[PDB]
Design a protein around this ligand. Structure first.
Ligand SMILES: [Mg+2]
Ligand SMILES: [Mg+2]
Length: 180
């Protein structure tokens, strides 16, 4: 029920081609993952706007920075094999990182953990970059947090902290004004 114009009113710096590509996919997968009321949609789209640079990115930009170098050989990421650190760099509208997390997402979205392990670039395609963000939101209980209007807990579950909170709130204020 969200128009392309409403999406652009939130993501005022999105390219028109980005709106064109992602608006149909957002409408489809928000419905499938029950992101389906004004408060759920407003909080979801505001987080997506920040996390993806207003649809500019579905993949991490690789340095490697000192931080990205230390993705290699991280058992908490499941990066057990040489090359896993870069192979499973962040991908998605909400960027997912590491072999074990690609495997989990792959199983949920394709029926097999191997799909995104064999072709990690699938997670950067518009289809799976969008569906994975909706699935993450659903699976981490963020619809229930949105119902309670707990934007800070939503931010912590997505980011691990409150990095970018002011940016996320700015998008949310635009979303409320254009969607409610
Ligand atoms: Mg501008
Ligand atoms: Mg990240």
């Amino acid at each position: 029920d969200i128009t392309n114009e409403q999406l652009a009113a939130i993501m005022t710096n999105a390219r028109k081609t980005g709106i064109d590509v992602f608006a149909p996919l957002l409408r489809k997968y928000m419905e499938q993952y029950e992101i389906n009321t004004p408060i759920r949609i407003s909080m979801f789209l505001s987080q997506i706007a920040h996390e993806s640079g207003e649809l500019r990115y579905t993949r991490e930009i690789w340095g490697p920075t000192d931080a990205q170098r230390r993705y290699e050989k991280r058992i908490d990421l499941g990066n057990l094999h040489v090359g896993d650190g870069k192979k499973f760099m962040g991908r998605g509208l909400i960027q997912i990182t590491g072999r074990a997390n690609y495997a989990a997402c792959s199983l949920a979205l394709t029926g097999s953990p191997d799909t995104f392990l064999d072709n990690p670039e699938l997670l950067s395609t518009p289809k799976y970059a969008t569906e994975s963000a909706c699935w993450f939101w659903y699976d981490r209980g963020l619809n229930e947090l949105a119902d309670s209007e707990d934007f800070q807990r939503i931010t912590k579950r997505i980011n691990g902290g409150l990095n970018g909170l002011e940016s996320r709130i700015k998008f949310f204020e635009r979303a409320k004004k254009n969607l409610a």
